[PDB]
Amino acid sequence: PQPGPSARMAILRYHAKGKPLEGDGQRLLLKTAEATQGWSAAALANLMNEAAILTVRRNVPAISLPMVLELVEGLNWGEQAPRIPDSEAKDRLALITAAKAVAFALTPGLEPIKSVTMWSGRRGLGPSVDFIAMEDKAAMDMHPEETELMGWRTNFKTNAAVVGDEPLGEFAHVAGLLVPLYAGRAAEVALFGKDGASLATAQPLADCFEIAYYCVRNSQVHPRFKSLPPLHTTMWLGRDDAGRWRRDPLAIGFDEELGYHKLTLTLLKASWRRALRLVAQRRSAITKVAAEMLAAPEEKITGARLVEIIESTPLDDLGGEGLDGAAAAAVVEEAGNEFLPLLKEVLGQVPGIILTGESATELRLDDATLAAVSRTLMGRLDVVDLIGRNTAVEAAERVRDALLHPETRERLLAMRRWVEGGPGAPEFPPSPLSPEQTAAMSPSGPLYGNLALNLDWWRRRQDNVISWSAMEILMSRRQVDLYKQDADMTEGAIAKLGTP
Amino acid sequence: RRPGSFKEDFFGSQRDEVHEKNQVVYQLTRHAITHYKKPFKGDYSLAIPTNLYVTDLFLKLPTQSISNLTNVENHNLSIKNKIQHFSVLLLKEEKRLKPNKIVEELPWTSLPGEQLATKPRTSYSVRAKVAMLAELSLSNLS
Amino acid sequence: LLSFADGNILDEPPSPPFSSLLIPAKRFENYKRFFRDTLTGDKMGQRKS
Amino acid sequence: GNKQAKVELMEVVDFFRTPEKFKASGARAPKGVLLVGPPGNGKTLMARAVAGESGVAFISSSAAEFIEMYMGLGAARVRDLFNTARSVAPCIIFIDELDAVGRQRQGGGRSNDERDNTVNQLLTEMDGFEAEQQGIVVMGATNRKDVLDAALTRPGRFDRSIEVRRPDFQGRLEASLASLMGGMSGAQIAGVANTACFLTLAVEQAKFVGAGRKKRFAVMEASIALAATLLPAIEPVEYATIIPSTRSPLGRTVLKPHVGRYTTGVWTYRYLREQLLVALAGRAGEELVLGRDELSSLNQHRLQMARQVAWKIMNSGMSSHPDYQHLRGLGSNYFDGSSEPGRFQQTTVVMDANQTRSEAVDADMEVEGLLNGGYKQVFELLVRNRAALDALTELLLEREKISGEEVVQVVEELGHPEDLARRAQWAGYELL
Amino acid sequence: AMENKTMEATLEASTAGDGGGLVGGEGVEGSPDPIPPQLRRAVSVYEAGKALLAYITPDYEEIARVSVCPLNVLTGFTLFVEDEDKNVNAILTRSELEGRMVVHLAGRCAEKLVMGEGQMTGMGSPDLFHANLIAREMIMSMGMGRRTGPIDLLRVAATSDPFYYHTTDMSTEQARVALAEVVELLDAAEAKAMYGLAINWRALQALTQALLDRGTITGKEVAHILESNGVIHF
Amino acid sequence: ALLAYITPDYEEIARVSVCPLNVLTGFTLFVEDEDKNVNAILTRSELEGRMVVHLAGRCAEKLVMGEGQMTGMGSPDLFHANLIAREMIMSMGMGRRTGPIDLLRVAATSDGDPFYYHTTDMSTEQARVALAEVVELLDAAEAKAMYGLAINWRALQALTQALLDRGTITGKEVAHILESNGVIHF
Amino acid sequence: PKPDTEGRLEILKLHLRNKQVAPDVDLLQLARDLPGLVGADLANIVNEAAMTAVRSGRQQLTARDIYAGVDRFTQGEVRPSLPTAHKLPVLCFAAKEIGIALVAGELRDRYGRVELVERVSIQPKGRAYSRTMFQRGTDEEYQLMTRGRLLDRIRLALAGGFAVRTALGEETNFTAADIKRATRMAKKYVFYYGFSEAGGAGITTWANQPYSGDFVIGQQRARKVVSTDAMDAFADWPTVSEDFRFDAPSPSDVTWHRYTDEVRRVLKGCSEDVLGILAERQEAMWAGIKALSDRKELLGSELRDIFDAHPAATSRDRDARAELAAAKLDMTIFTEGANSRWPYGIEWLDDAYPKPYWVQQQEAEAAEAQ
Amino acid sequence: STNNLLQNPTNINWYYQNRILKRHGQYLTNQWWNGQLSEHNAETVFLSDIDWRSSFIKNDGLDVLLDFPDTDQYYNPKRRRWLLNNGSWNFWFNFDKLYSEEIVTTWILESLIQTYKYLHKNTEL
Q: d(Cα G264, Cα G272) in Å, to the nearest integer?
A: 12
> Nearest by CB to B68, which of H18, H94, H100?
H94
Chains B, D: CB contacts within 8 A come to 25
* Number of CB atoms found within 10 A of residue A171's CB: 27
Question: Cα dist. F2→B49, F10, F160, G95 in Å?
Answer: 62, 11, 10, 89
The whole-angstrom separation of Cα C6 and Cα H92 is: 9
- Does A219 sit within 8 Å of C32, measured CB to CB? no
Furthest CA-CA distance within chain A: 95
CB of D403 less than 8 A from some CB of H:
no
CB of F75 less than 8 A from some CB of C: yes
Strand order in the sheet with E216-218: E76-81, E62-68, E216-218
How far the first Cα of chain G sits from its last, in Å, is 66
Residue C49 near chain A (CB below 8 Å): no
Burial label, D344 (beta-carbon count in 10 A; 0-12, 13-18, 19+): middle
d(CA D407, CA D237): 8
How far apart are alpha carbons A192 and F67 in whole angstroms? 44
Q: Do B74 and C3 touch (CB under 8 A)?
A: yes
Other Cβ atoms less than 10 A from the Cβ of B86: the count is: 5
Q: Whose CA is closest to B69, among C29, D353, C43?
A: D353
Sequence letter at residue F172: K
DSSP A309-328: HHHHSPPPPS-SSSSSSSS-
Distance of CA D427 to the CA centre of its chain: 31
Experimental method: cryo-EM
- Read off the amino acid at residue A244: R
- Please give the backbone phi and psi of residue D35, each rounded to the nearest 5 degrees, phi first: -75, 110
Q: Which of A236, A238, A243 sits opposite C39 (nearest CB)?
A: A236
Residue ranges with strand state E in A48-191: 113-117, 128-131, 156-158, 161-163
Closest to E193 in 3D by CA, of E56, E97, E39: E56
Which chains reach chain F with 3 or more Cβ–Cβ distances below 8 angstroms? A, B, C, H
- Helix/strand/coil (H, E, C) string of A374-422? HHHHCCCCCCHHHHCHHHHHHHHHHHHHHHCCHHHHHHHHHHHHHHHCC
Say if the Cβ atoms of G346 and E86 lie within 8 Å.
no
Quick check: G269 contacting E, CB < 8 Å?
no
A365 closest CA partner among A418, A417, A406: A406
What phi-psi label fits residue B37: left (phi over 0), alpha (psi between -120 and 50 degrees) or beta? left
CB contact under 8 A, C10 and G217: no
Instruction: Determine contact: A490 vs chain G, CB below 8 A.
Output: yes
Q: Which of D114, D132, D221, D274 is catalytic?
A: D221
Q: Could you tell me where the DSSP H helices lie in E137-200? A: 172-199
Contact G92, G44 (CB under 8 A): no
| Bridge partner list, E79 | E65
> Are G348 and H41 inside 8 Å of each other by CB?
no
Q: Which residues on chain B are in Cβ contact (under 8 Å) with F123?
A: 68
For chain H, report the end-to-end CA distance as a whole number of angstroms: 56
Distance CA B39, CA A494 (A): 62
E strand intervals along A93-146: 113-117, 128-131
Amino acid at residue number A276: L
CB atoms within 10 A of CB A302: 14
Q: Which amino acid is located at E3 in the chain?
A: E
Nearest partner of F102 among F116, F120, F121, judged by Cα:
F120
Query: How would you classify the pairing of strands D334-337 and A300-302?
Result: unpaired
* Residues from C in contact with B at Cβ < 8 Å: 1, 3-4, 6-8, 11, 13-20, 22, 24-26, 28-33, 35-36, 39
Q: Please state, in angstroms and rounded to a whole number, the distance separating the CA atoms of residues F159 and F175.
A: 10
Query: What CA–CA distances, in Å, run from G87 to B51, G94, G168?
Result: 32, 11, 10
Task: Give D164-168 contacts, CB < 8 A, sequence gap 24+.
Answer: D164/D2, D164/D3, D164/D5, D164/D35, D164/D36, D164/D37, D164/D41, D164/D42, D164/D43, D164/D46, D165/D3, D165/D37, D165/D38, D165/D41, D166/D38, D166/D41, D166/H51, D166/H54, D167/D1, D167/D2, D167/D3, D167/D41, D168/D3, D168/H63
Cα distance between residue D432 and residue D430, in whole Å: 6
**Which B positions 40-79 lie with beta carbon below 8 A of chain F?**
64-68, 75-76
Please give the Cα distance from H50 to H39 (Å, whole number): 10
- Establish whether G197 is a catalytic residue: no
| Phi-psi sector, A238: left (phi>0), alpha (psi -120 to 50), beta | left
With residue H75 as reference, give the H or E element that holds it. Answer: strand H73-75
Q: Do E and G have ≥3 inter-chain CB pairs under 8 A?
A: yes
Using a CB-CB distance cutoff of 8 angstroms, which residues of chain H are in contact with residue G257? none
Please indicate whether, in this complex, the C-beta atoms of A209 and D354 are within 8 angstroms of each other.
yes
Residue type, G104: A
Out of E129, E136, E168, the one facing C3 most closely (by C-beta) is E168
Contact F120 B65 (CB under 8 A): no
Q: DSSP assignment, residue F114?
A: S
Q: How many CB atoms lie within 10 A of CB G15?
A: 18
Chains G and F in direct contact, meaning 3 or more beta-carbon pairs closer than 8 angstroms: no
Amino acid letter for position A382: D
Largest CA distance in chain E: 53
Instruction: Work out the angle between the directed axes of helices D386-399 and D269-290 (0-180°, nearest 10).
Output: 80
Q: What angle do CA D175, D181, D185 make, to 5 degrees?
A: 60
C38 and H CB contact within 8 Å = no
Query: Residues D99, D132: contact at Cβ < 8 Å?
Result: no
**Shortest CB distance from A210 goes to which of C35, C38, C44?**
C38
Residues in a beta bridge with D403: D239
Q: Is E62 helix (H, G, I), strand (E, B) or coil?
A: strand
Active site residues of E: 47
Return all residues near A7 (Cβ < 8 A) that are at least 6 apart.
A41
A41 shares contact with chain G (CB less than 8 Å)? no
Do chains C and B meet with 3 or more Cβ pairs nearer than 8 Å? yes
**Chain G: touching chains (3 or more CB pairs < 8 Å):** A, B, C, D, E, H
Chain D CA closest to residue C30:
D334
C47 in A contact zone (CB under 8 Å): yes
Q: Do D358 and G251 touch (CB under 8 A)?
A: no
Triad B7, B9, B12: Cα angle to 5°: 65
Amino acid identity for residue A472 in this structure:
E
Q: What crossing angle do the helices spanning A260-281 and A203-213 adopt, rounded to 10°?
A: 130
Q: Tell me the backbone φ, ψ of residue H67, rounded to 5 degrees.
A: -100, 150
- Single out the residue of D334, D350, D215, D204 nearest to residue D286, CA to CA: D215
* CB pair distance less than 8 Å for C20 and G245: no
Beta-carbon contacts of B93 under 8 Å, excluding residues fewer than 6 positions away, are none
Beta strands (DSSP E) in chain G are 117-120, 132-134, 298-299
Q: Which of residues 164-203 of E touch H (CB under 8 A)?
A: 172, 175
